[PDB]
């Protein structure tokens, strides 16, 4: 849903999607050839399948092909400046691909903007869809475009002919966080096959020990696990599978 | 898209109420202006009012007599017309006119009035 | 106010012909000057949304230029539309304002 989406937001007005409680394979993106850049900070995409984290935010815009550079901590330029800010200890991904070919129209797109003039520079992960008249020099605008008054927004004009650095490209960021919370959002976990009837050492779901497994002839009710015995040691375990 | 709409023929020192609806484009962002053409006569500027609506401003000739004002909820212009004179026998343009910034400019199809007995 | 003055007010040419027209502010305007194109009655066509940056989808004929006081519009090689009227309009402050619009009028 956020890879494919069909049209993305202008970058002074980046949406925010927030991801939890399900089973994220980011390898599964990594290895999609797709990418123009694919970069980490503080992390790596394989790594990524072995951590937990309590939302994944991804955050998504298009920018034209040579201001890309400037999607990273501490970058300045207008998109930096004006437009999106990571943190300087940002811990996250920012993928990237040309969208030429979706993005682009033969009489020029120009339903993407940015944030061409503002008082100062964002926060990280600031926003600001704001559309006052900037007032560049002395005169209050009062709403009203003229000598030193400026609307702060300007479309890009994305024609299929562009060279490649004015050319439109999809930008998502991922950000990872963990709270003092349950960690919701995690890579996915492996299984392997059953062995009856040979010691074996063993992981059900978390439950570990070494033993011989074969068929049992008791029955549990729907919600139990495993079994212990008298002594409390484990005498039955249920396969998760 | 502009479409201008309440315009007619009216007497001298009559009222008439103009009316333009926006559509395929942000109207709220944008400072808004009426423009109008008397019969072979060059543009003259009406109004314009700012993208929230906070402020409107004129020309001489309209001046205190008219008001121009928004329904950005309604993505539609206004131009009431008061005290009407041979000066405001004219097509009425609705327009998004451009200034140094670059964006798409906007104006609709005009909407005429005529003033006479 | 600011006042704008069509150097020509009218013109005669014929198609393939080099154009020029240029209008003059009563005052100076630094680079705030747009220029429009307008058959009769139709609704403007912004050419040039300051003295010199010409419009998205605007054909690559048409240029603008000037500082201060003086302006162009140009046509680098006339087709059959651009027989009609062409407005400077000054974007630098209020009033909003139009010159006395040149008109292609000729066809031919």
């Known amino acids: 849903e956020v890879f494919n989406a069909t049209r993305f937001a202008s970058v002074y007005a980046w949406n925010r999607k927030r991801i939890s409680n399900c089973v994220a394979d980011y390898s599964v993106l990594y290895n999609s050839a797709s990418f123009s850049t694919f970069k980490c900070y503080g992390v790596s995409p394989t790594k990524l399948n072995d951590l937990c984290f309590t939302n994944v935010y991804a955050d998504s815009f298009v920018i034209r092909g040579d201001e890309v550079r400037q999607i990273a901590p501490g970058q300045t330029g207008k998109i930096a400046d004006y437009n999106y800010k990571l943190p300087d200890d940002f811990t996250g991904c920012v993928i990237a691909w040309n969208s030429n070919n979706l993005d682009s129209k033969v009489g020029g797109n120009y339903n993407y903007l940015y944030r061409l003039f503002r008082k100062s520079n964002l926060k990280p992960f600031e926003r600001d869809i704001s559309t006052e008249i900037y007032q560049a020099g002395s005169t209050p605008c009062n709403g009203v475009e003229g000598f030193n008054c400026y609307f702060p927004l300007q479309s890009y004009g994305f024609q299929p002919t562009n060279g490649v650095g004015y050319q439109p490209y999809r930008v998502v960021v991922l950000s990872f966080e963990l709270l003092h919370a349950p960690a919701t959002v995690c890579g996915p976990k492996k299984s392997t096959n059953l062995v009856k009837n040979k010691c074996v050492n063993f992981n059900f779901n978390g439950l570990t020990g070494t033993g011989v497994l074969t068929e049992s002839n008791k029955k549990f009710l729907p919600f139990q696990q495993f079994g212990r015995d008298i002594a409390d040691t484990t005498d039955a375990v249920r396969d998760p599978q | 898209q502009l479409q201008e709409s309440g315009g007619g023929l009216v007497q001298p020192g009559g009222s008439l109420r103009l009316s333009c609806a926006a559509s395929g484009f942000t109207f709220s962002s944008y400072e808004m202006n009426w423009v109008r053409q008397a019969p072979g006569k060059g543009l003259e500027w009406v109004a314009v009012?700012?993208?929230?609506?906070?402020?409107?401003y004129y020309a001489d000739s309209v001046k205190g007599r008219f008001t121009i004002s928004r329904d950005n909820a309604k993505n539609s212009l206004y131009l009431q017309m008061n005290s009407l004179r041979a000066e405001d026998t004219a097509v009425y343009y609705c327009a998004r006119l451009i200034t140094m910034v670059r964006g798409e400019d906007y104006w609709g199809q005009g909407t005429l009035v005529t003033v006479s007995s | 106010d600011i006042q704008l003055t069509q150097s020509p007010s009218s013109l005669s040419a014929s198609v393939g012909h080099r154009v020029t027209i240029t209008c003059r502010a009563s005052q100076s305007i630094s680079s705030y000057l747009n220029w429009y194109q307008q058959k009769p009655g139709k609704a403007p066509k912004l050419l040039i949304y300051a003295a010199s940056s010409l419009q998205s989808g605007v054909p690559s004929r048409f240029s603008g230029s000037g500082s201060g006081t003086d302006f162009t519009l140009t046509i680098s090689s006339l087709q059959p539309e651009d027989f009609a009227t062409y407005y400077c309009?000054?974007?630098?402050?209020?009033?909003?304002?139009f010159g006395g619009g040149t008109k292609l009028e000729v066809l031919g």
């Open positions: 309009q000054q974007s630098y402050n209020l009033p909003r304002t």
């Open positions: 009012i700012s993208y929230d609506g906070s402020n409107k």
